[PDB]
Structure 1
Protein backbone atom coordinates (compact mmCIF):
# COMPACT_ATOMS: atom_id res chain seq x y z
CA UNK A 1 0.00 0.00 0.00
CA UNK A 2 2.74 2.50 0.84
CA UNK A 3 4.55 1.60 -2.39
CA UNK A 4 1.47 2.06 -4.53
CA UNK A 5 0.70 5.36 -2.84
CA UNK A 6 4.20 6.74 -3.45
CA UNK A 7 3.90 5.77 -7.10
CA UNK A 8 0.44 7.38 -7.38
CA UNK A 9 1.94 10.58 -6.05
CA UNK A 10 4.67 10.32 -8.66
CA UNK A 11 2.36 9.68 -11.63
CA UNK A 12 -0.07 12.33 -10.45
CA UNK A 13 2.66 14.97 -10.30
CA UNK A 14 4.10 13.92 -13.64
CA UNK A 15 0.67 13.97 -15.27
CA UNK A 16 0.17 17.35 -13.63
CA UNK A 17 3.24 18.58 -15.51
CA UNK A 18 2.24 16.96 -18.81
CA UNK A 19 -1.25 18.46 -18.51
CA UNK A 20 0.32 21.92 -18.28
CA UNK A 21 1.99 20.85 -21.50
CA UNK A 22 5.55 21.59 -20.41
CA UNK A 23 8.25 19.27 -21.77
CA UNK A 24 9.23 16.63 -19.21
CA UNK A 25 12.12 14.18 -18.92
CA UNK A 26 9.78 11.48 -17.60
CA UNK A 27 11.24 7.99 -17.06
CA UNK A 28 8.01 6.37 -18.28
CA UNK A 29 4.61 7.64 -19.36
CA UNK A 30 2.67 5.99 -16.50
CA UNK A 31 4.75 6.25 -13.32
CA UNK A 32 2.25 4.37 -11.08
CA UNK A 33 2.10 0.61 -10.42
CA UNK A 34 -0.26 -2.09 -11.68
CA UNK A 35 -1.36 -4.66 -9.12
CA UNK A 36 -1.18 -8.21 -10.46
CA UNK A 37 -2.35 -9.66 -7.22
CA UNK A 38 -3.23 -7.58 -4.22
CA UNK A 39 -5.82 -6.91 -1.53
CA UNK A 40 -8.98 -4.89 -2.06
CA UNK A 41 -7.34 -1.74 -0.68
CA UNK A 42 -4.60 -1.81 -3.26
CA UNK A 43 -7.16 -2.32 -6.04
CA UNK A 44 -8.85 0.82 -4.74
CA UNK A 45 -5.53 2.64 -4.82
CA UNK A 46 -4.92 1.60 -8.42
CA UNK A 47 -8.41 2.76 -9.36
CA UNK A 48 -8.31 6.29 -7.92
CA UNK A 49 -4.69 6.51 -8.98
CA UNK A 50 -5.78 5.83 -12.54
CA UNK A 51 -8.64 8.32 -12.27
CA UNK A 52 -6.38 11.38 -11.95
CA UNK A 53 -9.06 13.02 -9.76
CA UNK A 54 -9.38 16.80 -9.74
CA UNK A 55 -8.86 16.61 -5.98
CA UNK A 56 -5.09 16.21 -6.33
CA UNK A 57 -4.74 19.26 -8.58
CA UNK A 58 -6.87 21.20 -6.09
CA UNK A 59 -4.83 19.96 -3.09
CA UNK A 60 -8.06 18.77 -1.43
CA UNK A 61 -6.34 15.64 -0.06
CA UNK A 62 -3.86 15.85 2.80
CA UNK A 63 -0.54 14.25 1.83
CA UNK A 64 0.67 13.78 5.42
CA UNK A 65 -1.07 10.41 5.46
CA UNK A 66 -1.24 10.01 1.71
CA UNK A 67 -2.54 6.45 1.39
CA UNK A 68 -5.36 7.14 3.84
CA UNK A 69 -6.40 10.20 1.86
CA UNK A 70 -6.43 8.05 -1.25
CA UNK A 71 -8.57 5.42 0.45
CA UNK A 72 -11.15 7.99 1.52
CA UNK A 73 -11.03 9.52 -1.93
CA UNK A 74 -11.67 6.12 -3.49
CA UNK A 75 -14.59 5.88 -1.11
CA UNK A 76 -16.10 9.13 -2.37
CA UNK A 77 -15.56 7.91 -5.93
CA UNK A 78 -17.07 4.50 -5.16
CA UNK A 79 -20.39 6.24 -4.64
CA UNK A 80 -19.73 9.48 -6.52
CA UNK A 81 -22.59 11.85 -7.30
CA UNK A 82 -21.25 11.83 -10.85
CA UNK A 83 -22.41 8.64 -12.57
CA UNK A 84 -19.54 8.81 -15.04
CA UNK A 85 -16.88 8.97 -12.35
CA UNK A 86 -18.54 6.30 -10.26
CA UNK A 87 -18.96 3.84 -13.12
CA UNK A 88 -15.41 4.60 -14.24
CA UNK A 89 -13.91 4.04 -10.80
CA UNK A 90 -15.93 0.87 -10.40
CA UNK A 91 -14.78 -0.35 -13.79
CA UNK A 92 -11.18 0.39 -12.80
CA UNK A 93 -11.66 -1.57 -9.59
CA UNK A 94 -13.21 -4.58 -11.33
CA UNK A 95 -10.27 -4.97 -13.73
CA UNK A 96 -7.30 -3.72 -11.72
CA UNK A 97 -4.85 -5.85 -13.72
CA UNK A 98 -5.62 -3.66 -16.75
CA UNK A 99 -3.70 -0.36 -16.81
CA UNK A 100 -6.20 2.44 -17.43
CA UNK A 101 -4.71 5.54 -19.04
CA UNK A 102 -5.83 8.72 -20.78
CA UNK A 103 -5.59 8.88 -24.59
CA UNK A 104 -2.90 11.56 -24.33
CA UNK A 105 -0.80 9.02 -22.43
CA UNK A 106 -1.40 6.40 -25.08
CA UNK A 107 -0.11 8.64 -27.86
CA UNK A 108 3.12 9.04 -25.85
CA UNK A 109 3.34 5.28 -25.49
CA UNK A 110 2.91 4.98 -29.25
CA UNK A 111 5.70 7.45 -29.87
CA UNK A 112 7.86 5.35 -27.57
CA UNK A 113 7.01 2.15 -29.48
CA UNK A 114 7.94 4.02 -32.65
CA UNK A 115 11.37 5.09 -31.37
CA UNK A 116 12.25 1.65 -29.92
CA UNK A 117 10.22 -0.98 -31.82
CA UNK A 118 11.13 -3.96 -29.60
CA UNK A 119 10.51 -2.20 -26.25
CA UNK A 120 8.61 -4.09 -23.57
CA UNK A 121 5.62 -2.38 -21.96
CA UNK A 122 2.49 -3.61 -20.21
CA UNK A 123 0.10 -5.19 -22.71
CA UNK A 124 -3.16 -5.07 -20.80
CA UNK A 125 -4.38 -1.49 -21.03
CA UNK A 126 -7.63 0.49 -21.42
CA UNK A 127 -7.90 3.99 -22.92
CA UNK A 128 -10.71 5.75 -21.04
CA UNK A 129 -11.81 9.31 -21.78
CA UNK A 130 -11.27 11.56 -18.76
CA UNK A 131 -14.39 13.12 -17.21
CA UNK A 132 -14.29 16.92 -16.76
CA UNK A 133 -15.43 18.43 -13.45
CA UNK A 134 -16.31 22.11 -13.05
CA UNK A 135 -15.85 22.41 -9.27
CA UNK A 136 -12.69 24.34 -8.41
CA UNK A 137 -12.05 23.68 -4.73
CA UNK A 138 -10.02 26.34 -2.94
CA UNK A 139 -7.01 25.02 -1.03
CA UNK A 140 -3.87 26.00 0.83
CA UNK A 141 -2.11 23.48 3.05
CA UNK A 142 0.44 24.86 5.50
CA UNK A 143 0.22 27.38 8.31
CA UNK A 144 -2.02 30.45 8.13
CA UNK A 145 -5.60 31.16 9.16
CA UNK A 146 -7.92 32.25 6.34
CA UNK A 147 -9.26 35.78 7.01
CA UNK A 148 -12.64 35.66 5.28
CA UNK A 149 -14.52 38.71 4.12
CA UNK A 150 -18.15 37.59 4.00
CA UNK A 151 -20.40 39.01 1.30
Structure 2
Protein backbone atom coordinates (compact mmCIF):
# COMPACT_ATOMS: atom_id res chain seq x y z
CA UNK A 1 0.00 0.00 0.00
CA UNK A 2 1.25 3.51 -0.90
CA UNK A 3 1.18 6.02 1.98
CA UNK A 4 0.12 9.60 1.23
CA UNK A 5 1.89 12.71 2.56
CA UNK A 6 0.35 14.46 5.59
CA UNK A 7 -1.17 17.53 3.87
CA UNK A 8 -4.09 17.52 1.42
CA UNK A 9 -2.88 20.22 -1.00
CA UNK A 10 0.75 18.99 -1.04
CA UNK A 11 -0.04 16.85 -4.10
CA UNK A 12 3.51 15.59 -4.68
CA UNK A 13 5.09 12.13 -4.98
CA UNK A 14 5.30 9.89 -1.89
CA UNK A 15 8.68 9.38 -0.10
CA UNK A 16 8.19 5.68 0.75
CA UNK A 17 5.76 2.75 0.39
CA UNK A 18 4.75 0.26 3.10
CA UNK A 19 4.37 -3.49 2.49
CA UNK A 20 2.34 -6.22 4.26
CA UNK A 21 3.60 -9.83 4.19
CA UNK A 22 1.56 -12.94 4.97
CA UNK A 23 3.11 -14.29 8.18
CA UNK A 24 1.24 -16.23 10.90
CA UNK A 25 3.68 -18.13 13.18
CA UNK A 26 6.98 -16.99 14.77
CA UNK A 27 9.28 -19.28 12.74
CA UNK A 28 7.75 -17.38 9.81
CA UNK A 29 8.97 -13.87 10.75
CA UNK A 30 12.56 -15.18 10.87
CA UNK A 31 12.29 -16.14 7.19
CA UNK A 32 11.08 -12.81 5.76
CA UNK A 33 13.57 -10.82 7.88
CA UNK A 34 16.51 -12.99 6.75
CA UNK A 35 15.46 -13.06 3.08
CA UNK A 36 15.05 -9.28 3.53
CA UNK A 37 18.84 -8.86 3.35
CA UNK A 38 20.42 -8.30 -0.11
CA UNK A 39 17.54 -5.98 -1.12
CA UNK A 40 17.97 -2.21 -1.75
CA UNK A 41 16.95 -0.20 1.36
CA UNK A 42 14.25 -1.44 3.76
CA UNK A 43 13.15 -0.76 7.35
CA UNK A 44 11.06 -2.42 10.08
CA UNK A 45 10.58 -1.28 13.70
CA UNK A 46 10.56 -3.31 16.94
CA UNK A 47 6.91 -4.37 17.16
CA UNK A 48 3.95 -4.29 14.74
CA UNK A 49 0.37 -2.90 14.48
CA UNK A 50 -2.13 -5.64 13.64
CA UNK A 51 -0.08 -8.77 14.39
CA UNK A 52 1.34 -8.98 10.85
CA UNK A 53 4.87 -7.88 9.90
CA UNK A 54 5.10 -4.87 7.58
CA UNK A 55 8.27 -3.28 6.20
CA UNK A 56 9.00 0.11 4.60
CA UNK A 57 10.42 0.75 1.11
CA UNK A 58 12.24 4.00 0.34
CA UNK A 59 12.39 5.67 -3.08
CA UNK A 60 15.79 7.37 -3.19
CA UNK A 61 18.46 6.97 -0.48
CA UNK A 62 18.44 10.69 0.42
CA UNK A 63 14.73 10.43 1.31
CA UNK A 64 15.55 7.85 4.02
CA UNK A 65 17.59 9.81 6.59
CA UNK A 66 14.81 12.43 6.78
CA UNK A 67 12.25 9.79 7.85
CA UNK A 68 14.72 7.75 9.92
CA UNK A 69 15.37 10.90 11.98
CA UNK A 70 11.71 11.97 12.31
CA UNK A 71 11.24 8.77 14.33
CA UNK A 72 14.50 8.72 16.34
CA UNK A 73 13.30 12.12 17.58
CA UNK A 74 9.86 11.04 18.85
CA UNK A 75 11.54 8.13 20.70
CA UNK A 76 14.04 10.16 22.74
CA UNK A 77 10.77 11.48 24.21
CA UNK A 78 9.00 8.22 25.06
CA UNK A 79 12.13 7.37 27.07
CA UNK A 80 11.93 10.70 28.95
CA UNK A 81 8.70 9.73 30.73
CA UNK A 82 9.64 6.05 31.08
CA UNK A 83 12.82 7.30 32.77
CA UNK A 84 10.91 9.33 35.38
CA UNK A 85 8.12 6.76 35.76
CA UNK A 86 4.68 7.52 34.30
CA UNK A 87 1.85 5.50 32.74
CA UNK A 88 2.63 6.08 29.04
CA UNK A 89 -0.31 5.43 26.69
CA UNK A 90 1.47 5.10 23.31
CA UNK A 91 2.48 1.64 22.08
CA UNK A 92 5.62 0.19 20.48
CA UNK A 93 7.88 0.47 23.56
CA UNK A 94 10.82 1.47 21.32
CA UNK A 95 9.91 3.75 18.40
CA UNK A 96 13.45 3.85 16.95
CA UNK A 97 13.45 2.35 13.45
CA UNK A 98 15.70 -0.57 12.50
CA UNK A 99 17.83 -0.37 9.35
CA UNK A 100 17.79 -3.69 7.50
CA UNK A 101 19.42 -3.48 4.06
CA UNK A 102 20.59 0.15 4.13
CA UNK A 103 23.23 2.67 3.01
CA UNK A 104 26.10 4.13 5.09
CA UNK A 105 24.85 7.38 6.68
CA UNK A 106 21.97 5.58 8.42
CA UNK A 107 24.62 3.49 10.22
CA UNK A 108 26.37 6.48 11.82
CA UNK A 109 22.81 7.75 12.42
CA UNK A 110 21.46 4.50 13.93
CA UNK A 111 24.13 4.14 16.64
CA UNK A 112 24.03 7.79 17.81
CA UNK A 113 20.29 7.44 18.50
CA UNK A 114 20.43 4.02 20.18
CA UNK A 115 22.46 5.15 23.23
CA UNK A 116 20.25 8.18 24.10
CA UNK A 117 22.68 11.18 24.19
CA UNK A 118 20.24 14.15 24.43
CA UNK A 119 19.02 15.79 27.64
CA UNK A 120 15.51 17.24 28.17
CA UNK A 121 15.23 20.47 26.08
CA UNK A 122 11.54 21.32 25.31
CA UNK A 123 12.16 24.52 23.29
CA UNK A 124 9.79 23.86 20.35
CA UNK A 125 12.30 21.53 18.65
CA UNK A 126 12.46 22.50 14.97
CA UNK A 127 10.69 19.76 13.00
CA UNK A 128 12.08 20.83 9.63
CA UNK A 129 15.87 20.51 9.16
CA UNK A 130 15.97 18.33 12.31
CA UNK A 131 17.62 15.69 10.10
CA UNK A 132 21.00 17.40 9.60
CA UNK A 133 21.11 19.09 13.03
CA UNK A 134 20.87 15.58 14.51
CA UNK A 135 23.47 14.14 12.11
CA UNK A 136 25.90 16.93 13.09
CA UNK A 137 25.53 15.95 16.76
CA UNK A 138 26.43 12.38 15.73
CA UNK A 139 29.96 13.32 14.62
CA UNK A 140 30.94 15.50 17.61
CA UNK A 141 29.81 12.80 20.06
CA UNK A 142 32.50 10.58 18.52
CA UNK A 143 35.18 13.28 18.90
CA UNK A 144 35.07 12.66 22.66
CA UNK A 145 34.69 8.92 23.11
CA UNK A 146 37.16 7.87 25.82
CA UNK A 147 38.23 4.53 24.27
CA UNK A 148 35.44 2.56 26.02
CA UNK A 149 32.65 4.73 24.56
CA UNK A 150 34.45 4.73 21.19
CA UNK A 151 34.65 0.93 21.22
CA UNK A 152 30.84 0.59 21.40
CA UNK A 153 29.86 3.36 18.96
CA UNK A 154 32.30 1.89 16.41
CA UNK A 155 30.63 -1.52 16.87
CA UNK A 156 26.97 -0.49 16.44
CA UNK A 157 28.16 1.42 13.37
CA UNK A 158 29.82 -1.75 12.03
CA UNK A 159 26.85 -3.96 13.05
CA UNK A 160 23.63 -1.90 12.66
CA UNK A 161 21.22 -4.87 12.59
CA UNK A 162 20.10 -5.44 16.20
CA UNK A 163 18.14 -3.02 18.40
User: TM-score by structure 1 length?
Assistant: 0.56
How many residues are paired up? 97
- The reply to whether residue 19 of structure 1 matches residue 83 of structure 2 is yes
Q: Which of 42, 45, 65 is the equivalent residue of 2:129?
A: 65
Cα distance in 2 between the residues matched to 1:89 and 1:36: 18
Q: Which has the higher helix share?
A: 1
- The reply to whether residue 46 of structure 1 matches residue 80 of structure 2 is no
Change (3 A) 1:85 1:34: same
Q: Which has the higher strand share?
A: 2
Once the two structures are superposed, the pairs formed by residues 1-150 of structure 1 within 5 Å of their partners are 1-53=65-117, 55-58=118-121, 63=126, 64-99=128-163
Q: Determine if contact 1:77/1:89 at 8 Å carries over to the other structure.
A: no
Q: Which moved more, 1:72-81 or 1:8-17?
A: 72-81
2:56 equivalent in structure 1: none
User: TM-score by structure 2 length?
Assistant: 0.53
Alignment gaps of 5+ in structure 2: 1-64
CA RMSD of aligned residues (A): 2.1
Change (3 A) 1:2 1:77: same
